[PDB]
Symmetry: none
Subunit: 501 residues, 4 copies
Amino acid sequence: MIPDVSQALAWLEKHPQALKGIQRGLERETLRVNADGTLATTGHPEALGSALTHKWITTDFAEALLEFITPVDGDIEHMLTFMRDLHRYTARNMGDERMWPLSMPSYIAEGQDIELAQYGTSNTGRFKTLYREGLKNRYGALMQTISGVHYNFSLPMAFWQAKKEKISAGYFRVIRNYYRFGWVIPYLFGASPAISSSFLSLPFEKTESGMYYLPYATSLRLSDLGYSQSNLGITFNDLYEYVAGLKQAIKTPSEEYAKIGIEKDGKRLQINSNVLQIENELYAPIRPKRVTRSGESPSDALLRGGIEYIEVRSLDINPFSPIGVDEQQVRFLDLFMVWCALADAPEMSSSELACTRVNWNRVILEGRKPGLTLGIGCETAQFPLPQVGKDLFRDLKRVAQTLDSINGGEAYQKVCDELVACFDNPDLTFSARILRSMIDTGIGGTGKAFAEAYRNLLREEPLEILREEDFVAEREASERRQQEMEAADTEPFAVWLEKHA
Amino acid sequence: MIPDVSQALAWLEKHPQALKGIQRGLERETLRVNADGTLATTGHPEALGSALTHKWITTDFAEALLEFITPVDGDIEHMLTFMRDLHRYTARNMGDERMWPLSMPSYIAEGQDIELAQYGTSNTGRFKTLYREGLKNRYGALMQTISGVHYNFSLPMAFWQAKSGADAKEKISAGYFRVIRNYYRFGWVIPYLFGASPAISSSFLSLPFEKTESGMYYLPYATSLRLSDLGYTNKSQSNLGITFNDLYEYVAGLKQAIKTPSEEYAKIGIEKDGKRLQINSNVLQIENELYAPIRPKRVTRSGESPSDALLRGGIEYIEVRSLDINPFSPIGVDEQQVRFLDLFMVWCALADAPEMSSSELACTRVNWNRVILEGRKPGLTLGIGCETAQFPLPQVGKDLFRDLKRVAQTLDSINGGEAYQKVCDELVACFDNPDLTFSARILRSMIDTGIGGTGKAFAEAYRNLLREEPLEILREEDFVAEREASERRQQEMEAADTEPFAVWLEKHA
Amino acid sequence: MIPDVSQALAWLEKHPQALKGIQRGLERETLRVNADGTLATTGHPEALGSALTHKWITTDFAEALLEFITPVDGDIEHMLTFMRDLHRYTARNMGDERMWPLSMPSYIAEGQDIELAQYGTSNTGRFKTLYREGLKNRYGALMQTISGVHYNFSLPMAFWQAKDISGADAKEKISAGYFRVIRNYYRFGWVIPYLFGASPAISSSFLSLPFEKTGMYYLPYATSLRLSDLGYTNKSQSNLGITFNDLYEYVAGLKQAIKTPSEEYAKIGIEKDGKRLQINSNVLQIENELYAPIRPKRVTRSGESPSDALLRGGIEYIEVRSLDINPFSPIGVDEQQVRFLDLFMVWCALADAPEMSSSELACTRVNWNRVILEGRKPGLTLGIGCETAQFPLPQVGKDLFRDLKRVAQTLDSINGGEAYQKVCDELVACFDNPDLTFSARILRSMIDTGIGGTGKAFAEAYRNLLREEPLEILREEDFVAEREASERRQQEMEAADTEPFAVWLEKHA
Amino acid sequence: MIPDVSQALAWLEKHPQALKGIQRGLERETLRVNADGTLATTGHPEALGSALTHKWITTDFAEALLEFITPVDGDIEHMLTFMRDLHRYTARNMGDERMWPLSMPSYIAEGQDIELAQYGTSNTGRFKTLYREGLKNRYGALMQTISGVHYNFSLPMAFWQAKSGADAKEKISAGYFRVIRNYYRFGWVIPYLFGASPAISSSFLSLPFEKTESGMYYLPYATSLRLSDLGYQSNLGITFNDLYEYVAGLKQAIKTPSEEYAKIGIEKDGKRLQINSNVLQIENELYAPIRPKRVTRSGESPSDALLRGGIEYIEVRSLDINPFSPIGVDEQQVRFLDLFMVWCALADAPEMSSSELACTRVNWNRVILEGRKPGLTLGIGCETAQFPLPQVGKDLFRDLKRVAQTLDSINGGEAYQKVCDELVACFDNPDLTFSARILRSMIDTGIGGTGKAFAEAYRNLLREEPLEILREEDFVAEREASERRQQEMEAADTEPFAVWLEKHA
C-alpha cells in the first residue's frame, strides 16, 4: 500500500546536501480559561497588545482563543524555545486565567454566548470579525473553539535544484501523498478520543460525568463532529486547475447561505452568500501557500509566484507539552513531508481525493483498534495498520539517516525508532495515554490539572530568546499599528468589500 | 496484466507426457436441513456410522454439517461419480432430512444453539469436539455453518522430471509455492466464474447492500460473499504475516502462530464452571484453525503435525479451499469446474512468480476484493497489485484463457478427446457476458424466492434425484461394511485409552 | 574494576552547593506476629484505621503485612524520627502483637492460608485485593510475606543546573542522568547486600545449593537470600527485555510487557468458579508486578499509570528496593544506611555508564549472584560483567570507598559536620573484615537460636523499647485525626461507585 | 554469556579470503535391520567387501553396525552426494534389509547377543575385534549400538597465515585447542538444534522419565539422551590448553589401572576378554565430544601423530542421527557447523583446568535433559543460572551471521545466511527443533514404529535413485582391492596372535 520509493530514496542518499535549509514555522491555539475550567469572558489580555497586528501573538475565531505564532525558522530548538517564551510571558500576564491544554473544550454549554474575536474599528479589523460572524452563522460557534496546531514547512531551493512550475508541481505531489497517507498523524499524535456532551450516530460510550468517548478513537477533532464544500471538486494536480477551482468556488452561490441573509436590522451576517466567503474558509488538512502582498489574495499570490511552502493543519494539541507541541512531532513531520515529496503520486480527481478520507475516518474513529485494516481509497479494507506503518517507517528511517548526516548526530533516527514502536503498541500513542487519564478524571478534570501544572511551571521559567522588553515594545508597537489603521481615511466598507481578495 | 508464459507453454507443448497422471481429490461440505431449511437437530445419521473414523463421510464444525471426501483419484468422472454415490446413499438414509445446496445458509436465529460435532468419549474424539467448542467461543458458531468445496491437486512426478537427490523434494516444493503465489495473483478468476454467494442473510451480520423485507442482504454485482470478510471469522494467513517464498520460512511462521498467546482468547478463559471452552489460548489452537484459501500439504504420519510433515518431506500436494458450493449441481461441484481448476493450476505452475513479501501478498488481494464484491460490474478494472486500476476485466480473462486453451490442447491430446477445450470455450464467454456466471444466475433466483426459498427448492429437487439414482461405483453393502468398521474403530479407540482426558490434554495443547 | 571517576569528583568538589536539597523517603514492611512468633490472624489494627487510604500507614500483600511510609523529606534525622513515630504509635495500638524484626518469615508453613490484604468494597479497593489474589495464584502466598525496605531519592535541581537545561530540555537531561544512575546501580550496587544484606538463612517451609541444615537452611558466606532466586518469585525486569538506556525505550518495553499474554498464567485461568483469580492473564497484571530492585519513578496523577507519568514528565525520582530489613534497628532501617545510599546514588550519577543491551545487563548480575550467595567468602573475586573473575572483592570496595569519601567530604562541608565521612570509615572496615557486615552478624545469631528464636527475641525487645518511647513529631491526636480522615475518604469512594465491579474492572484490567 | 568477538569478526570481514578452502569430511553410522526392525544377523554385505580395509564403507562395534566414511572434501554438495551414493549402493545390495534411521535402537533386547564386528584372521583384524569384546565386557553391548554422526573440519592455511615455516606449526595446534575449549563452553547449541533422541526404549534402562503405553521412556523437553549418562573416566584429568599436556595426559590414561576392569579378568576359559585392564584399552576408547586429530600413518597411534605433526583437523562427534535425512545428515547442519567451528576459532578462550572443563558440562546437561523447556536458563560454568537460553542463542547467531556474510561473499550466493535465519528461529521456537519434531512422532508410534516407517521410505527412496559420482564399477573395483588387502595381510603375518599381541596390549 505504501508505494515503491526505493529509487527516489537512493537518489536522496546520493544528494544529502539537497536537504540542507529546511524552513519551519509553528502555530498553536489555546483557550483562555478560568481556574474552574470555565471559558474566560475577559478581553484579549492587555500586555499582549493588539491581536489584530502583533507579530507573534493573536486570536483565532474567538476572543478567548489565543493563537501563538513563530517566525519562520531554520532551527527546531530555537523555534520551540521562541514558542515557549510566548507561552511563558502570556501565562504570567493573564491574571488568574490559564491556557487549556487540550484540543477539545469542556465546560461550554450548548448555545453558550461565545464572544467573537475583536479587532477594533478599522476596515480590516471589522472584516476579520465579520468573516467570523459569517462562520458562526453557517457552522456554529461551538466547534470553532476547538484548538489545534499548524506546521509550516518549505524545502530548500537546493532540493529542487538537485532535481517554479517544477516547484509547485512538486508541492502538489506532496499534498496528494498527504491525503493518501497522512492518517498516520492522528494515529500517532491524535489527542482527542473524547468530547463533552455539551458538544453534540456512533457507538459512543458514556461516563457518569457525561463524557463521550470512543474506545479506540484518536482524533474526534478531525471528525465530522469537530469540523460541506463537497460540490466544489477542488483538485491538487496542477497550479492553474487548483486556483481555477478555488476561484470558481468564490463565485459559487449557495442556497443554504443565501437564506441566512446578508443582513437583518442592519447587522451584516456574513461577507457574502457564496459557498466560500473568502478562500481560507476552504477546509484544508494540508494547504499550499505563498506569502501574500497587500490587497492580494492567496490564489493571486499562488498564481503569481507559484507554491512557496505548505501548511500542515491536522495536529491536535499535544497535552503532554505545555506549548502543546514537541520536538518529536516536529521532527516526524520533517521526515514525513520530505517522503511525501519523494514518493510518486498519481493525479487524483475530486472524488478520488474524497475517497482518501475513508482511511482517515477509520483511523480517526477507531485507529487503535486491534486487527484494524486499511484500504486503498474507497476500496475494501485489506491492509493491517501496523504493517503499513512499519513499511512507511522503513523509508522515513532512510530519510532520517540522510538528514542526520547533514545535521550531525542521530536525533531523527531515534525519533523513527520511538514512533515505529507505536504501531506494535497503540497504547504508546497520545490518544491512548490521554484517554486513560480522561476516563478517571474526565476532560474537565484532566484539563484543569494539566493547565494548573503548566501554569506554575511556565510562570516560574525564565525568558530565553524574547526578553520582557521585547514584548512590551511589540505590545506598544502593535497597539499603534492598529490606531494608525483606525485613524486612516479608509474607503466605504461596501465598495471596499467589492475591491478585495 | 497477465504475464508472458510463451516459453513455459512452448516447453509444455513439446513435453505433453509431462502432464500425464494428474492426481486429484474432492471434499464437499453441506448442512443437514429439514424441508423448511433449518438445521437438523438430530444426530449424525446412524447409517453413516462413526464420523470420527469413517473413510468417506464425516462431519465438520457442526453435528449437522456433513463433509464428503473422495479418495485421491486420477480419473475425473470416476471421482465425481464416487462423490455422487456418497450423496445418493446419504440422501436415502437421513430420514426426512435433506441437504442444503448453497454455501450461504438460510436465516439462523440462535447461533449458540447449534450442536457442535460430536465424536464420542474417546480422548481424541473429545479433543476434536473441544477444538470446535473453542472455535464457537472465539469466533461464534453461526459463521462456521457457511459451507464450501475443496479441490486437492498433485502434479505427476514426470512433470518435475521433465522440468537430483535432496534437491528434488526442494524443487517440487518451490514449484508448488510458485503455484500458490500465482493463485494469489490471478486466482480471483475462480470466484468470478464459480462464485455463488452474492447474497447473505441479515442474521449472519458499511457495504452498499440492497435489502429485502425478509432480511436478505445482497450486492448487485457480487460473486462470493463467502470469501469476503463477512463470510469467514478467522484470520487470513496473508494477514498473520505468513509467506510463500520458502518452505522453512512458511513452516516457521505457522508454528510461531501455534505457539503465540493471545490476549483476546485468554479473556475468554480456558475454562468456565468446570466446562472446558478451548484447547488453549494461543492464536491458533491447532494448524487447521488458520484461514487458508490455498494450503500447502503433505500426508501426515501418525502423531506428526501437518507442518512437521511439510518440513520433513516438503510439499506433496495443494489444497484449493476457495470454491463456493455449486447450487446448480446436487453434489455441489461439477466436471466443468474440476477441469477448469486442472488448467489453471497447471498454468500457475508454468507461470513465473516473483517472490513476495507479506505486504506484496496483501496487495494481490486488492483485485480479489474487487471481484468478490463487484466482479460482475460493467467497466470493472483490475490492477497490478496496489497499482492504479487500468486493465479491464474481460480483456484480462480472455488473455488468461488463450494460455489455458493451449494447456487444454495438450491435456486433450494425452487423454484423447476435446473436453478441456470445450471448457475453455464455455468459460471464456463469461468474460463478455457476466450474466453467464454462477453468481448472476443464483442472484436472479434469490431475488425471486430468497435464499431460503431458492435453497429449500433446490434441496427438495436434489433430494428426489439423489434418492432415486442407483449407486454406480459403491454399492449398498459397502456403506454398510464401512458403517460397521467405522463404529468398530471408534469403539477400539475408546477402550484403548489409558488416561484421563485432563491428563491426556495437558500433554497435547 | 571501579571506573575512573576523577574528572567528575573534582568537578563536584568545586560545586558543593549543587548537592544541597536532596529529597528522600522510606518504606518499611513488617509482619504482625504473636508473642509465639505465629502470624497474627486478626485484622488491620483499629487505631491505624483505613489501610486503603491512610497517608502514612498501610498494608502490603497480607492483611498482617504492615507497610510504613514517610512523606518526602530533605532531612535525614527528621525522616527517620517520623518513621520511628509510626512504629511507636503502632506498637502500642496492636495488643500483645509485635513486629517481626527480619526480612525472612518463620513459623509460616508452605500451604498456610494467609489472609490477603483487605481494602473494602469500593471498586479501587477491590482491584487492589485482586491484584494480590493474582500474585498468590501465580507466585504463591508465602513468598510475598518476605519483607524489605524501600529508599526513595531525588537529586536537587541545582545538581542538574550546575552540571543548558531549560524549558523542555530539562525533563530529558534529568531522565538521562537517572538512567546513568540505574545502569551504574546494576554494575556496582552489589555493594549493598554485601554490607547490609541480612538474610544468610531461610526456613525449610520455603525451599540446588550447597545449603546447610540445622529445620533451618543457610549458606555460610551468604548475604541476601531474599534477593536470590529462592527469595523473590517474580520476573526480573532484566529478564523481560527491559532496558535502561533511554526514557522511551524503557517505557515501550514496560508497556509491551503488560500487553504480553502469558500461556502459563492463562492456565491458572482467570475465573475459578465464580471467584475471580487474577486481574488478567498477562505476564504483568499491572506495571508494579514487575520485579525491580531499582525503579525509575514519577508521581502519578489519577487516571495515569507509572509509565504514562514517566512518558509525560520524565524521571522525577528513584526508588531503591533491594534493602533487607535491618535487624539491628527497631524500625528496620538506620541513619548509617540512608547516608551510605546518598553517597552511592550520587556517585552512580557521576560515574560514566555506557549504554547496555539487555544481555549486557544480565551479565552485570553475575557479580550480584556471587555476592548474594557467597559475598563474605575469603578470596572471593568479581569480574567485569561476564568476563573472567579476577578482582578481589575487598580491593574493589576499598576503591569505591575512596570515591565515596570525596563525595562525603563535600556533603559534609555543606551540611556542616562530619557524619557522612564517619559512615565511610565505619563501612570500609567491612571489606577487610566481613564479620562486620549485617549478614555475618545476624547469621551467628540465627545459628545459635534459629531464625524463629532470633526473631522473637528482637521482636519482644524492640516492642518494649517502642512501647515506652515518647512520640516526637506526631502527636497521638495527629494519628487519631487520620483514622477518621482515612476511614471516611474510603466511604466517600464507596458511595461514588456508580458502575458495578465487572464493568469498571473492564476499563481497567 | 556469549563473548565479545567484535574485533576478531571485524578482522575477518576485512580478510574474506582467509576462509577460502575449508575442508571437511563426514562419517555416519547405521544399524542393518529387517523390516520388523530387529537386528540383522547376516554378515557384512558382500558387494561392500572387506570391512577391515575398505576405503569408504566399514563397520563400527557390531558386525551389523555399518559405518560410512567420505573422503576429505572441499565442496559441501559434492561430499553429501558422495555419502549418498554410498547409501544408495548399499541400500540395493543388502537384500531385504534396511537402515535404522535413528540414533536410538528400539528392537534390541537387554543383554542381547550382538555379533561383534568381524575382521578376519589377520593380526590386526583380530585385535580390532578383541577391542570390541573388551568394550562389550566393560560397558555393555547394547550401548555400543547407539549410533551417530561425525564431522571433520579443518581451516585452510590461508586462515592461519593471515592471523599471524614451523613458527606457524604451533600456532595451529593452539588455534584448534582454542576451538575445542569454546566447543566445550558453547557447543551444547548442537544438541539443542539437532539433538534427536528425546526418547529411549526401556531395554536401555533416577530421572523424571515419563513413560508411554508401548513401554517407551522420554523426557518432556529433552534433546539428546544419546549424549547423556544413560547413552554412552572423569578422573583422567585430560585438558585442552597445550599439545604436550594433552598427549601426556592421554598416554598416561592408557598406562593407568582400573580395579573395576581387573575384576573382569583378561581371560576366561581360553577366551580373551579385554586387551588389558587399563582404564583405556586404546586411545580411542577415550570418550570425546570433540576430538583433535591428525591423519595417522601406519604404526601410528593418534597421540603419536599429534605429537609429531600437531593438530591437523577437528572431529565433531556430538551429532545425533538426523531422522529427516536418508543419509542421517543434511546440508543445513553441515553449514551451521562451518559457521560455529569458525566462530569457535575466533572467540577468545582462556585456558582451562580439569575442574573448569567439568563445569562447562552443567549447561550441556541442562540442554540435553531439558533444553526445550520454557524459561530455561544457563550459566557460566557451575555458577548460578542466569541467562535466558533463547537470548544466548540469538546473541551467538548475531555473530554466526556475520561469519555467514563473509563465507557467502567468497562462495557466491546466500546459503549460509539463510541457514542462520532458519536456525535462529529455533530459539524463538523449540518446536522447530529436530527433537521436538521427532518426539511428537515417537510419543504416538514409539521409537520402533517411527524408525521402521522412516527406514522403509528411505529404503525405497534410495534403491530407486541413480548413482551420481561413484559408478558401480568403482564399488565393484573397491570390493576386489579391499579383498586383497585383507588377504595380503592375512598372508604376510609372521607370528601367532598370541604373541603379536604381546607388544601391542
